[PDB]
Amino acid sequence: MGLSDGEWQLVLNIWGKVEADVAGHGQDVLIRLFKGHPETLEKFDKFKHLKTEAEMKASEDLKKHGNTVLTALGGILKKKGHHEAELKPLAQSHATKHKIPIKYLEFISDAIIHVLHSRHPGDFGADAQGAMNKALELFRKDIAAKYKELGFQG
Numbered sequence: 001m002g003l004s005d006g007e008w009q010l011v012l013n014i015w016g017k018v019e020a021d022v023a024g025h026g027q028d029v030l031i032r033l034f035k036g037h038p039e040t041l042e043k044f045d046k047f048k049h050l051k052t053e054a055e056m057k058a059s060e061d062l063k064k065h066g067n068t069v070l071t072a073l074g075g076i077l078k079k080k081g082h083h084e085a086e087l088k089p090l091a092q093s094h095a096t097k098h099k100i101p102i103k104y105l106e107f108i109s110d111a112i113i114h115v116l117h118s119r120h121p122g123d124f125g126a127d128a129q130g131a132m133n134k135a136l137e138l139f140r141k142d143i144a145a146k147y148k149e150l151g152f153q154g
C-alpha cells in the first residue's frame with residue numbers, strides 16, 4: 001500500500017499549496033463533505049442549522065474546524081507513511097468518542113481531492129491525483145486497522 005519517494009513528493013508538493021491557506025481549504029473540504037453527504041453533518045450538532053453552501057461559508061466556526069482537520073492531516077502526510085504517533089490519538093477519538101464510520105473517511109478523502117481540483121487545476125495534474133489518492137488510501141487503511149483494534153466496527 002506504500003508510496004515511492006516520487007509519489008510522496010507529488011503529495012507534499014500539492015500539499016504545500018494547501019498550506020498557503022489551510023483554513024480556507026479546510027473550510028471548502030467540510031462544505032463539500034456536508035453538502036455531498038448530509039449524514040456526516042449530523043455528527044456536528046453545533047452545525048445543524050447550516051443548510052446552504054452560503055451559510056456554511058459564512059461560519060467561522062466551521063472554518064476553524066476545517067483548519068483543525070487539515071492541520072492534523074497535514075501532520076500525517078508529512079510523515080510519509082511513518083505516522084503511527086499521529087494516527088494514534090486520531091483513531092482513538094474518532095473510533096471511541098465521535099464514532100465516525102470508516103466510510104465517512106472515504107467521503108472526506110473524496111472531498112479533499114475535489115477541493116484540490118477546484119483550487120489548483122494547473123498544479124494538480126494526473127500524476128499528483130494518483131499519488132494523493134494513494135496517500136489518502138494508506139491513511140484510511142491504517143486508521144481502519146486501528147478502529148478494529150479498538151473494537152469499533154462502524
Ligand code: HEM
Binds near residue numbers: 040043098
Ligand atoms: C481526514 C480525516 C479527519 C481528520 C484528520 C480529522 C481530524 C480531527 C481533529 C484533529 C479533531 C479534534 C481532535 C479530536 O477530537 O480528535 C476532530 C474532531 C472531530 N471530528 Fe474529525 N477528522 C477527520 C474526519 C472526520 C469525519 C469524516 C467526521 C464526521 C463525518 C469527523 C467528525 C469529527 C467530530 C464530530 C469532532 C469533534 C468536533 C467537536 O466537538 O468540536 N471527523 N477531527
